[PDB]
Amino acid sequence: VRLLESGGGLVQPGGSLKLSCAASGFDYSRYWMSWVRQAPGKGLKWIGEINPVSSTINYTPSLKDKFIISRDNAKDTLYLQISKVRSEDTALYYCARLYYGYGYWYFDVWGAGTTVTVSSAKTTPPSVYPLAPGSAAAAASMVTLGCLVKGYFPEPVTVTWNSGSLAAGVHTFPAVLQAALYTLSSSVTVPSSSWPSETVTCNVAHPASSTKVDKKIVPRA
Amino acid sequence: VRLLESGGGLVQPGGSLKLSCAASGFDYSRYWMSWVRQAPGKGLKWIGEINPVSSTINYTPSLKDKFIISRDNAKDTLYLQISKVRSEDTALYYCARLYYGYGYWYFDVWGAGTTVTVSSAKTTPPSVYPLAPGSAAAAASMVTLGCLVKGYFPEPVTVTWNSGSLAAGVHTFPAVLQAALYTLSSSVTVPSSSWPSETVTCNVAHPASSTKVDKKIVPRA
Amino acid sequence: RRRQLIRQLLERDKTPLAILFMAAVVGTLVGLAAVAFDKGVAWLQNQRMGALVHTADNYPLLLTVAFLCSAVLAMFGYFLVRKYAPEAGGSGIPEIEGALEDQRPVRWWRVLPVKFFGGLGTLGGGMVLGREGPTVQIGGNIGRMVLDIFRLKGDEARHTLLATGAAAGLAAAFNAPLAGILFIIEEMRPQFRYTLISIKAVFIGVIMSTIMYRIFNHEVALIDVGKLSDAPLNTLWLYLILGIIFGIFGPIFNKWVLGMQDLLHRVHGGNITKWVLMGGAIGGLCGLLGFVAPATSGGGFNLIPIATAGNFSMGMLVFIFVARVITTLLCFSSGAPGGIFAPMLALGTVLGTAFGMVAVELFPQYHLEAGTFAIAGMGALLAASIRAPLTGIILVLEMTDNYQLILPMIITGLGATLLAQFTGGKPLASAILARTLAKQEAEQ
Amino acid sequence: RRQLIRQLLERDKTPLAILFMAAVVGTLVGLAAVAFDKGVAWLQNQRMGALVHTADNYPLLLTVAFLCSAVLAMFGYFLVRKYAPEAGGSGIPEIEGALEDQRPVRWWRVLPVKFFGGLGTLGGGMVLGREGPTVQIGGNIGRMVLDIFRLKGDEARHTLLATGAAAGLAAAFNAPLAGILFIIEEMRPQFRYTLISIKAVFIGVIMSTIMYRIFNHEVALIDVGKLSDAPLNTLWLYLILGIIFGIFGPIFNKWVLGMQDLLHRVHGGNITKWVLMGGAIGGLCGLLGFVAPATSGGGFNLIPIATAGNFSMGMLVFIFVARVITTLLCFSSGAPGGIFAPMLALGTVLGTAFGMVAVELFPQYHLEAGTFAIAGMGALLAASIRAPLTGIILVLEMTDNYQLILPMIITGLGATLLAQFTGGKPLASAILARTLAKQEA
Amino acid sequence: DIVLTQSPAIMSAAPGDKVTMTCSASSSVSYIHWYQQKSGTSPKRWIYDTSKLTSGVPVRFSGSGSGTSYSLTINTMEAEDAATYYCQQWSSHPQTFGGGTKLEILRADAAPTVSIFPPSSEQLTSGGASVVCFLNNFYPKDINVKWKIDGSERQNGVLNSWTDQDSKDSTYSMSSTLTLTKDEYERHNSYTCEATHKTSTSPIVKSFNRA
Amino acid sequence: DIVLTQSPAIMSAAPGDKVTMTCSASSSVSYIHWYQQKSGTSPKRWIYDTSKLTSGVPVRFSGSGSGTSYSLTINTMEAEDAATYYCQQWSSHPQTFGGGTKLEILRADAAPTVSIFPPSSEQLTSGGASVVCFLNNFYPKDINVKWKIDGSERQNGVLNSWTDQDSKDSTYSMSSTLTLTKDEYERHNSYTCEATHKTSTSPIVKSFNRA
Ligand SMILES: [Br-]
Ligand SMILES: [Br-]
């Protein structure tokens, strides 16, 4: 059983968006479907629920048309509309299949999630900068490299070293927002014999702005 | 309930094409599905059936893998693979939902059909020409207009007037085959007050080449 | 007595080949009859809604022919009863119960033509009565007829062929084979003494009639509700409460049907003319309502699929219930040919839905479908008035085909029967026999 | 006449004490049936765990399977032979007699002997159902509450005995209606009027079912899914299948009776030769519960596989013949455990076989063997123990294919009819007739 | 496999007539079905199990027969019944169909409406020149079209095409298409279309002149 | 609505340990459920109805409680037990989740492997200057970073970012980035990066000189 939810991303405050959830692996009928959102670094909160015949739709103690949950059993998909979107609605949105044991219901199977960002800020590509050890660095056992991905919006960026082949000793720190732009840094610690005698490339993708960059780390002269 | 079979058209002698019938409006399980064909001008020959769980597939007296009837309950779809296609396989192919009364089974709901033309010819989109009355028209009560559809292969084409809002008083003449190309015309009859004061358009569709031509009948200059 | 048991145990389940074969021809005939009756009633209802087209422009004249068609057919029904067969009145289940107890005559030469054509009229006018009444009784007489025609002798044959007829009768009235057998071995049978009824023979009868019914009623169920939701364990207690509610109501509905028999008996005083006229009056009112608010009239099989689906409003449900109670009492208690069995299923559906709705809004954490409560309460009124739960529960289970609701249905059914007892209520079919049987003594 | 008018107005008036004492029986029967079902599964699990730790060396694990099942069988046969000989075999015939006041209900003995004894035979993986245990244990529990609360009367003694055995069958199949219908078709004193209150039986059946569901909800004993429908021009096939069940029904009755006799010679009544032979049969079952698991065990696991038509024609014949053997051995030997369940599995296998034949002979009926499987499933029950009505409703409650009712009824009836016309007798009554006629001789 | 043969291959009757068509079988059959296929549509389950009517089939239709002979009967036929009626058995595997009975309608006369059409300017910018001439809504279907270029008769390159009988009015229609080259078409002036039909002794003529 | 409050907000325990996390309710609840959310993946159903294990959950996991105070329990904690556990009720509508309990693998202390980096020559070609300082692989997560420009302390334009516990050693990393304007960066020379950790009383200094 898989729940694949789409429709997330960047919206302007006061706008609206239609989150979708396509299902595969089970009879989508017979099953109650539900939406649960998780605010960044916060708890899980129940949005609403809908029964198989759509004859019952219940939402959390919230505003009149703030949430509009519907479903189409013919496409096996669950929808959610958020109206007049504010900074509160910035969250990770899971659709879930509902079931029960004795009859006190539980959230049976969850989906991957979609991240809704509610901000006036403009979609902006990142700048990729290589961080090579200084012209005074004492080359030990391990040599730490890295690259700075600064001034992008919105999340996410994906950083991979040597097209993912260099998978150990990697540290992609969480991005930090400032003046409506994100900034993160990634660190790859390789052996001292591994660099600079071998090419360590940092790869950054920011799909929001169609940005794909491979910045090479060369030693400082 | 509606069965909408497709995937047919032009195939080279000895080749192989896969017909798909997409079902909707009824639980596609529980139901045995069948294929029946009708060669031009002639009658009905049963091809084969398949039960819901795919555990029984019976064919008409054929050969090896001449026909391969399969189904995918997940997509609500029936399939028919024809191999080493000869000129007898040139026909209209119906997917039929099977059911019974006292127990002796019948063909319950029939699909629209897809046409398979076995030939070495080339797929050619039609030329659509507006047939408006000569500048010396004695425009009486009703005015007869038409559009000429020539130089297409294979069959068929679907002529409708003004997306079909104009149904009454239309004649579409059966195609005539000359120099390995088909030619047909369609004649609509409207009130003289309805034209040229209002738009009269013929909509010719040739699914094989995926062409649709919307010709607007203009009075002669 | 141990040695006799050993003799008996070795001779168990051995029904004479004559009885078995005769039970076969009983079922066959009951089936054909119940098919003919069902087709005849559907034709008269069709002619009646055929005239409301010829007079669809004149609304007063429309309401007139809606009354006058049902009246004339009720009158004809009430008459054939009063003039030719007083026994063929009401349901007829209590009459055939008396026949199995050897206290009533099974005058088939009289009842067969009366109950058939009489019921045809009352049901055909769309009065609030079922087929059970006619078909079970007619069934019992068909079994008696072929006992007399073939001159079959002995306690086994007379009891068995009388029971198999009744069974085939109910089984054709609901397309519910098991219910017919379960009706016999819980309700029809003599309840206080041993009886020589061959259950195996009852079966054959029930089978043939079910087969006969299925020859002419293929591909249309009487009640199609489709697979409802499941019932979680923490929900069960709510069906027990539904039981208790039906449990206090079961005996109260019996007092009304018994009292209304007495209250309407004054209006005609047992006179043929005043009865037939009161009879047409009630009938006509049903044909009128069988247009202006059809939920209040007719058998009751049509609103069951609707009410379960939750397509009625809480306002409308309450209206349906009250108006159906009034129309059920006016038709059955009046002594028209026809069963109270089917309308009792329709009433329980309504009341069950109403509870279910109240249950849904009160308990969102249970994820209730008012329709599961509609089904649990469907045969619950049969389990509190008639006092035949194991008949009702299986009767429902065969028509609604929602086995996953087996516990809620039992729990409601049993809840109905326990409170039906504890509030001093009496099995409606026995209570009617014990009044007709007592009236057979009191006038001596 | 006036007697009847007095009776009718007093119809369905069960004394509240009986009703309340009914509720207490089902509860106790349910929970015990739950615990019995947990223990047998527990012991089966251990046997699979021992096979894992000696997974290498083929003749080594074939021995530990034998010895695990032999030891546990021996424990059962012993507990029965040493403390309660009446608790051997099914127990259904024993309780039937108890309702006829022709047998005693020694609960202080039977309860622990049948519980722990069955645990042995069932847990070892012998061809025996849970009914035997649960039905008997059920009645005995209903007797316990009679004695403990000193309830007086024929009614109270018959009723609390009946509800117990009903609730017993209920929690043995998750089938409430089947339990109730079992009491009023087979269990009740068959030839005279009895004071068994149906209302009280119900209440008891409810409780044990609720008790079973509180532990075993969300998993059914047999899942088959929704099968196809059965057109009218097909019904005659179900009559023929019933006729085949009609002739085999009594022939299987003979063997179970005769094999009870032939296995009595091997021990001659000796507690030691009995235990050692019973351990040899039990051992054979655990050994076969590895080399061909569909020939051994309860048989509930193969039904779904049979109904789906997953077995071939040969594989079905084998499974049938082998299961004819293994069923007799375990039941006829007087091991604690029902023949009820193994007869279901025999019915499915034979049914599927007939359906497979049917499918190819008539491609125009668009058959699915699995439908004949379900119609044949309780057909043996209709032809051997001769309770068709209980049999039909038992299948209906476990398979849930109500659209197959006519096929189910026609086959079931066609069994009980030809079982009557070929001399056959209700197997559970014949065993009672044996036990009573051996008593007064 | 059972060979079903349908008695009349093509039959013609006027509305009000009682119409019986027959489906005869090589071996013995039971509960045979019937299908209506109107011109240009998919078959529709008409009668099934010998004599049952599918939901929507008017009660003017009825079916009967047993063993080898079976018949679909229309009691008082109507013009809208103009179809081809296939029978089908499945009492013996594999199922098999009939040849068909093409029911045709007999109505009163109806004179053809002739409409002449000059080669469109788009077709002339392509080297072709197809002069079209529609004859619409005539009965009976017997018609004779005649092409005269500058009074002189033409018979080369002409293509004719008739429709089936109409489902509601019961009239046929025809299209005549004189195809020429661009140069061949332009080197004349008078184009006429002569339609001779039962309804008229003197042929209905429609013509255009390029100038 | 009912408010669930999970006792340990963040907790650490070594592999092979009796782990006990509470979930106290505001009002009265029954048959709560527990969900395991690992870093970067969907929440999964773990324990349901106070104690029942989901198909897949190891038997080291257990649950118990009643009325107002429940608990998830792990007998012999493992490495693959590191995650955030969410209790959730639905005995009273609307359903509510707990704040979450983050279970982390406790380990032996480790000193931060400090690396300092000069602003890239590509970034300077844009008027910006970010001085990056990686503090990699330490335990516990508690650390203090301090920047010194020309020996003098700086607190403005610093951005600190910790990773979640690593899945190969269960240590924490941290990055400190000092953002300056090209002009501000070029009027200074010494840039030091002081990491203050529990491992050493004297802080690990890492610096570079522009000259
Ligand atoms: Br009555
Ligand atoms: Br036994």
Q: What is the DSSP string of F41-90?
A: S--EEEEEGGGEEPTT--TTEEEEEEEEEEEEEESS--GGG-EEEEEEE-
Burial of E104 (0-12, 13-18, 19+ CB in 10 A): middle
> How far is it, in rounded angstroms, from Cα D41 to Cα C424?
47
**Which residues does chain B have within 8 Å of residue C218's beta carbon, measured at their own beta carbons?**
101-102
Q: Is A173 close to F45, i.e. CB distance below 8 A? A: no
In a mutational test of the F interface, the residue from C237, C363, C365 whose CB has the highest number of chain F CBs within 10 Å is C365
Closest among C331, F115, D97, E93 to A189, alpha carbons compared? F115
Using only C-alpha atoms, what is the Rg of chain B? 21
Q: Note the Cα A104 to chain centre separation in Å.
A: 31
For residue F139, give the DSSP letter. Answer: B
Helices then strands (H, E): number in chain E? 2, 19
Task: Find out whether A174 and A183 touch, Cβ atoms under 8 Å.
Answer: no
Q: Which residue do the tokens 């429609």 mark?
A: E206
Distance D80 CA to ligand 2 centre (A): 13
Task: Find out whether C239 and C363 touch, Cβ atoms under 8 Å.
Answer: no
H/E run at residue E208: strand E204-209
> How far is it, in rounded angstroms, from Cα E134 to Cα E176?
6
**Which residues does chain D have within 8 Å of residue C191's beta carbon, measured at their own beta carbons?**
7-8, 11
> How far is it, in rounded angstroms, from Cα D162 to Cα D101?
12
Going C432 to C438 to C443 to D1, the CA torsion angle's sign is: positive
Report the gap between the CA of D73 and the closest CA in chain B (Å): 42
Fold assignment, F108-210: Immunoglobulin-like (2.60.40)
Between the alpha carbon of residue A96 and those of residues A27, A90, F100, the distances in Å are 14, 19, 19
Distance D88 CA to ligand 2 centre (A): 7
Between the alpha carbon of residue D270 and those of residues B4, D300, D435, the distances in Å are 76, 33, 18
Strand partners, E103: E11
Neighbours of C155 (CB within 10 A): 11
User: Which residues have C-beta within 8 Å of that of residue C101, sequence separation ≥ 6?
Assistant: C190, C433, D4
Q: Judging by DSSP bridges, how do beta strands F101-105 and F128-138 pair with one another?
A: unpaired
Give CB contacts under 8 A, 24+ apart, made by A54-58: A55/C310, A56/C360, A56/C367, A58/C364
Report the gap between the CA of D359 and the closest CA in chain E (Å): 13
Task: Find out whether E72 and E84 touch, Cβ atoms under 8 Å.
Answer: no
The resolution, in angstroms to one decimal, equals 3.4
> How far is it, in rounded angstroms, from Cα E47 to Cα D373?
34
H/E run at residue E191: strand E190-197
User: Which residues have C-beta within 8 Å of that of residue F8, sequence separation ≥ 6?
Assistant: F21, F22, F101
Give the nearest partner residue to C410 out of D102, D176, D400, using CB atoms.
Answer: D176
Task: Find out whether E84 and E103 touch, Cβ atoms under 8 Å.
Answer: yes
Q: Which residue do the tokens 């509030």 mark?
A: C423
Fold assignment, D1-441: Clc chloride channel (1.10.3080)
Evaluate whether E1-107 and E108-210 have a shared fold.
Answer: yes
> How far is it, in rounded angstroms, from Cα F70 to Cα F25?
8
Give the nearest partner residue to A187 out of F96, F98, F134, using CB atoms.
Answer: F134
Tell me which residues of chain D, numbers 34 to 63, contact chain C at a CB-CB cutoff of 8 Å.
none
Please provide the CATH number assigned to the domain covering A1-120: 2.60.40.10
C365 touches chain F (CB under 8 A): yes
Give the type of residue at C265.
Answer: H
User: Which residues have C-beta within 8 Å of that of residue D250, sequence separation ≥ 6?
Assistant: D383, D384, D419, D422, D423, D424, D425
What is the DSSP annotation of D236-261? HHHHHHHHHHHHHHHHHHHHHHHHHH
Please tell me the number of Cα atoms within 13 Å of C135 on its side-chain side.
36
Domain locations along chain C: 1-444
Going D235 to D236 to D240 to D246, the CA torsion angle's sign is: positive
Residue of B nearest to D231 (CA): B103
Task: Find out whether A31 and A52 touch, Cβ atoms under 8 Å.
Answer: yes
Tell me which residues of chain E, numbers 178 to 207, contact chain D at a CB-CB cutoff of 8 Å.
none
Strand partners, A63: none
Task: Find out whether F73 and F12 touch, Cβ atoms under 8 Å.
Answer: no
- Structure token pair of residue D410: 């026609």
Task: Give the length of chain B.
Answer: 221
Backbone phi, psi, residue F4, to 5°: -95, 135
Closest among E195, E1, E185 to E93, alpha carbons compared? E1
- C25 Rama class: left (phi>0) / alpha (psi -120 to 50) / beta: alpha
H/E run at residue F206: strand F204-209
In a mutational test of the E interface, the residue from B129, B145, B147, B214 whose CB has the highest number of chain E CBs within 10 Å is B129
> How far is it, in rounded angstroms, from Cα F196 to Cα F140?
12
Helices then strands (H, E): number in chain C? 18, 0
This structure was determined by X-ray
In a mutational test of the B interface, the residue from D224, D236, D362, D366 whose CB has the highest number of chain B CBs within 10 Å is D366
Q: Judging by DSSP bridges, how do beta strands F101-105 and F10-13 pair with one another?
A: parallel
Domain locations along chain F: 1-107, 108-210
Give the nearest partner residue to F31 out of A43, A45, A102, using CB atoms.
Answer: A102
- B203 Rama class: left (phi>0) / alpha (psi -120 to 50) / beta: beta
Burial of A163 (0-12, 13-18, 19+ CB in 10 A): exposed
Tell me which residues of chain E, numbers 49 to 78, contact chain B at a CB-CB cutoff of 8 Å.
49, 52
What is the DSSP annotation of D296-364? SS-STTHHHHHHTT-S-HHHHHHHHHHHHHHHHHHHHTT-SSBSHHHHHHHHHHHHHHHHHHHHHH-TT
Residue F183, helix vs strand vs coil: helix
Distance C429 CA to ligand 1 centre (A): 7
Residue C191, helix vs strand vs coil: coil
Strand partners, A174: none
Task: Find out whether F23 and F7 touch, Cβ atoms under 8 Å.
Answer: yes
- Structure token pair of residue C128: 């609030």
Evaluate whether A1-120 and A121-219 have a shared fold.
Answer: yes
> How far is it, in rounded angstroms, from Cα D137 to Cα D114?
7
Burial of C248 (0-12, 13-18, 19+ CB in 10 A): middle
> How far is it, in rounded angstroms, from Cα A62 to Cα A40?
20
List the shell of residues around ion ligand 1, using CB closer than 5 Å: C 90-91, 94, 432
- Structure token pair of residue C412: 């409601």
**Helix residue ranges per DSSP H, D13-83:** 16-53, 58-83
A59 touches chain C (CB under 8 A): no
> How far is it, in rounded angstroms, from Cα B116 to Cα B5?
12
Q: Is D363 close to E92, i.e. CB distance below 8 A? A: no
Strand partners, F24: F5, F69
Distance D89 CA to ligand 2 centre (A): 4
- Structure token pair of residue E130: 């197809």
Give the nearest partner residue to A32 out of C232, C360, C367, using CB atoms.
Answer: C367
> How far is it, in rounded angstroms, from Cα B84 to Cα B66?
7
H/E run at residue D135: helix D131-149
Q: Is C218 close to D232, i.e. CB distance below 8 A? A: yes
Between the alpha carbon of residue C292 and those of residues A117, B49, C231, C286, C289, the distances in Å are 57, 50, 37, 10, 5
- Structure token pair of residue B55: 């555990």
Burial of D393 (0-12, 13-18, 19+ CB in 10 A): buried
Closest among C287, C280, C250, C265 to C381, alpha carbons compared? C250
Class for the domain spanning A121-219: mainly beta
User: Which residues have C-beta within 8 Å of that of residue F135, sequence separation ≥ 6?
Assistant: F112, F113, F114, F143, F145, F173, F174, F175, F176, F195
Backbone phi, psi, residue D397, to 5°: -85, -15
Q: Which residue do the tokens 């294979």 mark?
A: B154
> How far is it, in rounded angstroms, from Cα E148 to Cα E206?
10
Backbone phi, psi, residue F177, to 5°: -115, 125
Task: Find out whether D1 and D179 touch, Cβ atoms under 8 Å.
Answer: no
> How far is it, in rounded angstroms, from Cα D111 to Cα E180?
105
Strand partners, F97: F88
Closest among B183, B184, B200 to B145, alpha carbons compared? B200
Going C308 to C310 to C314 to C316, the CA torsion angle's sign is: negative
> How far is it, in rounded angstroms, from Cα C138 to Cα C112?
6
> How far is it, in rounded angstroms, from Cα F171 to Cα A144?
16
> How far is it, in rounded angstroms, from Cα D17 to Cα D32?
23
N-terminal to C-terminal alpha carbon distance within chain F: 64
Backbone phi, psi, residue F54, to 5°: -75, 150
Closest among D326, D361, D331, D336 to D240, alpha carbons compared? D361
Between the alpha carbon of residue B203 and those of residues B162, C182, D27, the distances in Å are 7, 66, 75
Q: Is C367 close to A105, i.e. CB distance below 8 A? A: yes
Report the gap between the CA of C227 and the closest CA in chain B (Å): 13
Distance C89 CA to ligand 1 centre (A): 6
Closest among D38, D161, D147, D25 to D91, alpha carbons compared? D161
Residue B188, helix vs strand vs coil: strand
Residue of F nearest to C361 (CA): F93
> How far is it, in rounded angstroms, from Cα D368 to Cα D316?
16
Residue of C nearest to D414 (CA): C204
> At what angle are helices D271-291 and D313-332 packed, to 10 degrees?
160
Give the type of residue at C223.
Answer: I
H/E run at residue B149: strand B142-152
Closest among C6, C427, B93 to D8, alpha carbons compared? C427
Give CB contacts under 8 A, 24+ apart, made by D351-358: D351/D241, D351/D375, D351/D376, D351/D377, D351/D379, D352/D306, D352/D307, D352/D309, D352/D311, D352/D316, D352/D376, D353/D313, D353/D316, D353/D317, D353/D320, D354/D241, D354/D244, D355/D309, D356/D309, D356/D313, D356/D316, D358/D237
Fold assignment, F1-107: Immunoglobulin-like (2.60.40)
Task: Find out whether B185 and E177 touch, Cβ atoms under 8 Å.
Answer: yes
D364 touches chain E (CB under 8 A): yes
Give the nearest partner residue to D433 out of C9, C192, C431, using CB atoms.
Answer: C9
Q: Judging by DSSP bridges, how do beta strands B57-59 and B114-118 pair with one another?
A: unpaired
Q: Which residue do the tokens 């030997």 mark?
A: D333
Please tell me the number of Cα atoms within 13 Å of C75 on its side-chain side.
14
> How far is it, in rounded angstroms, from Cα C80 to Cα C124?
15
Give the nearest partner residue to A144 out of F35, F91, F134, using CB atoms.
Answer: F134
> How far is it, in rounded angstroms, from Cα E177 to Cα E190?
16
Distance D183 CA to ligand 2 centre (A): 17
Closest among D133, D182, D194, D75 to D336, alpha carbons compared? D133
For residue F182, give the DSSP letter. Answer: H
Going D51 to D53 to D56 to D61, the CA torsion angle's sign is: negative
Burial of B140 (0-12, 13-18, 19+ CB in 10 A): exposed
Backbone phi, psi, residue C220, to 5°: -140, 110
Backbone phi, psi, residue A183, to 5°: -150, 120
Identify residues after which chain B is interrupted (C–N over 2.5 A).
none
Neighbours of D216 (CB within 10 A): 15
| Touching chains B and F? (3+ Cβ pairs < 8 A) | no
Task: Find out whether D90 and D186 touch, Cβ atoms under 8 Å.
Answer: no
Give the type of residue at F211.
Answer: A
Q: Judging by DSSP bridges, how do beta strands B142-152 and B182-191 pair with one another?
A: antiparallel
> How far is it, in rounded angstroms, from Cα C280 to Cα C285?
8
- A107 Rama class: left (phi>0) / alpha (psi -120 to 50) / beta: beta
Neighbours of C74 (CB within 10 A): 33
Q: Which residue do the tokens 């009149």 mark?
A: A64
Q: Is F94 close to A176, i.e. CB distance below 8 A? A: no
H/E run at residue E145: strand E143-149
Using only C-alpha atoms, what is the Rg of chain A? 22
D3 touches chain E (CB under 8 A): no
* Letter string b/e over residues E181-206, b meaning 16 or more CB atoms within 10 A of that residue's CB: eeeebeeeeebbbbbbbeeeeeebeb
Distance A208 CA to ligand 1 centre (A): 79
Q: Which ligand is nearest to the CA of D135?
A: 2
Going D277 to D280 to D285 to D291, the CA torsion angle's sign is: negative
Domain locations along chain A: 1-120, 121-219
**What CATH architecture applies to the domain C1-444?**
Orthogonal Bundle (1.10)
For residue E125, give the DSSP letter. Answer: T
Backbone phi, psi, residue C383, to 5°: -90, -5
> How far is it, in rounded angstroms, from Cα F101 to Cα F79?
16
Closest among D141, D160, D165 to D91, alpha carbons compared? D165
Q: Is C232 close to A55, i.e. CB distance below 8 A? A: no
